[PDB]
């Protein structure tokens, strides 16, 4: 039948999760942002649309830092992005508190990964409406 797209964790007959696919649409509708890996670091850049002359220039920062060595930028629903970074920060603090060393990028990546995946498991929550580009430098 139909209606497979009305609830978040439902598998459609072809094995898809339509709500996650709709979340992607919100992302594609967002500003463009990128990341470039160089020989010893990474660079992040984002497009900030000027809705009007009234926006104070250089004041509505979109790129965010996690711990002291990680950068995160995203496209889509900005509030969802912030929510994800808040979690990322708690995740980083937790790792440093227990292991002392600042969190490795791959480790941090999975932390965000597991959390985002978690929001595709229940119909009581909605998927994140953002795609996130992040990274930094670590032990290796």
């Amino acid at each position: 039948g139909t209606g497979y797209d009305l609830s978040n964790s439902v598998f459609s007959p072809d094995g898809r999760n339509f709500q996650v696919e709709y979340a992607v649409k919100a992302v594609e509708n967002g500003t463009t942002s990128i990341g470039i890996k160089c020989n010893d670091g990474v660079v992040f850049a984002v497009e900030k649309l000027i809705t009007s002359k009234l926006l104070v220039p250089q004041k509505n920062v979109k790129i965010q830092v996690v711990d002291r060595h990680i950068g995160c930028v995203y496209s889509g629903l900005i509030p969802d992005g912030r929510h994800l970074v808040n979690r990322g920060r708690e995740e980083a603090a937790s790792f440093k508190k227990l292991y002392k060393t600042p969190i490795p990028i791959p480790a941090f990546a999975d932390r965000l990964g597991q959390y985002v995946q978690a929001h595709t498991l229940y119909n009581s929550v909605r998927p994140f409406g953002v795609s996130t580009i992040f990274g930094g430098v670590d032990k290796n």
């Binding site: 004041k59 920062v61 830092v65 711990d67």
Partner: protein, 233 residues
């Protein structure tokens, strides 16, 4: 409720015309055993504040971790973190005081005595104390433990009241502090000869001196002392 195990003795400080000075030796005692010698008890926060801690060393290390986090946290979504919105000495103190008082109120204190030294953004000198009970106070000179009994009297001969601050130079102040550290080394059984000293100047910034040593000690007169009353040789 607990009991201190590895401990740090005195932390002394005073303010002069352009800033503040704070010092503390590098010892970590275990009862009467002078167990550790490479212990730094002066914690720099940014470039305008230094936190000197005495008491339980395990709790000191915890406070250290708390401070590094305050810095990280303050930098989040803060484009002015190294300017107008950088951590002020007064913000750091209020935070620690708050923590100290909450911990004693839950009958589980951080067994320490802390002195926060720094220069505010408007140039004002900042010097305030807080301990395991949550008790706080300010004075031209501040010292914890033994230094409260032997350092304040010497440091107060230099700055006895507020009006003496502007008349006091970095040289005079540092000289007074260094002499006090020597006196403490003479009469405090839990002190060390090596210590650190930090200066927070509203002009020269933060100067952190490591591996200082008590020098110019008088011991020669000891050769003439014999017996405990009637012995002649």
């Amino acid at each position: 409720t607990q009991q201190p195990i590895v401990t740090g003795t005195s932390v002394i400080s005073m303010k002069y015309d352009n800033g503040v000075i704070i010092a503390a030796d590098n010892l970590g005692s275990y009862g009467s055993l002078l167990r550790f010698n490479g212990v730094e008890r002066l914690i720099p926060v940014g470039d305008n504040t230094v936190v000197g801690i005495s008491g339980d060393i395990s709790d000191m290390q915890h406070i250290e971790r708390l401070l590094k986090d305050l810095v990280t946290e303050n930098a989040y979504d803060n484009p002015l973190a190294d300017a107008e919105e950088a951590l002020e000495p007064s913000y750091i103190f209020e935070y620690l005081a708050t923590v100290m008082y909450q911990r004693r109120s839950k009958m589980n204190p951080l067994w320490n005595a802390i002195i926060v030294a720094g220069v505010q953004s408007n140039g004002d000198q900042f010097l305030r104390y807080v301990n395991l009970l949550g008790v706080t106070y300010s004075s031209p000179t501040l010292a914890t433990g033994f230094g409260a009994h032997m350092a304040n009297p010497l440091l107060r001969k230099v700055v006895d009241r507020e009006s003496d601050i502007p008349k006091t130079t970095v040289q005079v102040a540092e000289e007074a502090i260094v002499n006090a550290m020597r006196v403490l080394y003479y009469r405090d059984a839990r002190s060390s000869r090596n210590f650190s000293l930090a200066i927070i100047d509203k002009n020269t910034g933060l100067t952190f001196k490591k591996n200082l040593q008590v020098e110019n000690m008088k011991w020669d007169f000891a050769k003439d002392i014999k017996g405990y009353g009637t012995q002649k040789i």
